[PDB]
DNA sequence: GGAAACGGTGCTTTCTGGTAGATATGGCCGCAACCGATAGTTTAACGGAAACGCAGGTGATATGA
């Protein structure tokens, strides 16, 4: 599970004494993305990298792709992907800022996966 | 009624030469024993065959990387 990987990273880029909440928020992002089905047949390392940059980002602490991409084996490429594609789900825009916001449900899930066949149609 | 005198020769005896076995000493011939040597296992440990697993000549379905 994404769990071990988060934790081996921060404890490899060894951030700040903020580790433990830097975890904990990547573990509620993981949880909510994989609620979101933007985990099934998907890299765990690439999950665990993305989830850690979104957690730095909700502690306002900042970090360079260089470092993250040094502790996961995913190319940057992957990791810039994923963040527009999180960008890109219900509310992320209106619920990405201060106070981590308690929306949780799925709603109506809508991955690339089946949207590309819906566009080439 | 018989024993004493002594002639007959049957039966026996050593001096000896014969028969011929015996062996102290001798010289060959070859058995009993040792130190010697050739051949033996099966494994140190890694050199070997047979035993062993992934590639490359197409193709190419998915959706992520």
């Given at each position: 599970d994404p769990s071990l990987f988060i934790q081996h990273f921060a404890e490899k880029l060894?951030?700040?004494?903020?580790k433990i909440k830097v975890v904990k928020d990547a573990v509620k992002l993981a949880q909510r993305m994989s609620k979101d089905w933007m985990?099934?047949?998907?890299?765990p390392a690439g999950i665990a990298g993305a989830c850690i940059l979104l957690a730095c980002r909700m502690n306002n602490l900042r970090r360079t792709h260089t470092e993250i991409v040094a502790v996961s084996h995913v190319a940057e490429e992957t990791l810039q992907q994923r963040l527009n594609e999180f960008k890109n789900t219900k509310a992320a825009k209106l619920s990405?800022?201060?106070?981590?916001?308690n929306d949780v449900e799925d709603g109506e899930a809508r991955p690339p996966s089946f949207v590309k066949n819906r566009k080439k149609e």
């Open positions: 060894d951030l700040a004494d903020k985990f099934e047949g998907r890299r990405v800022q201060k106070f981590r916001e």
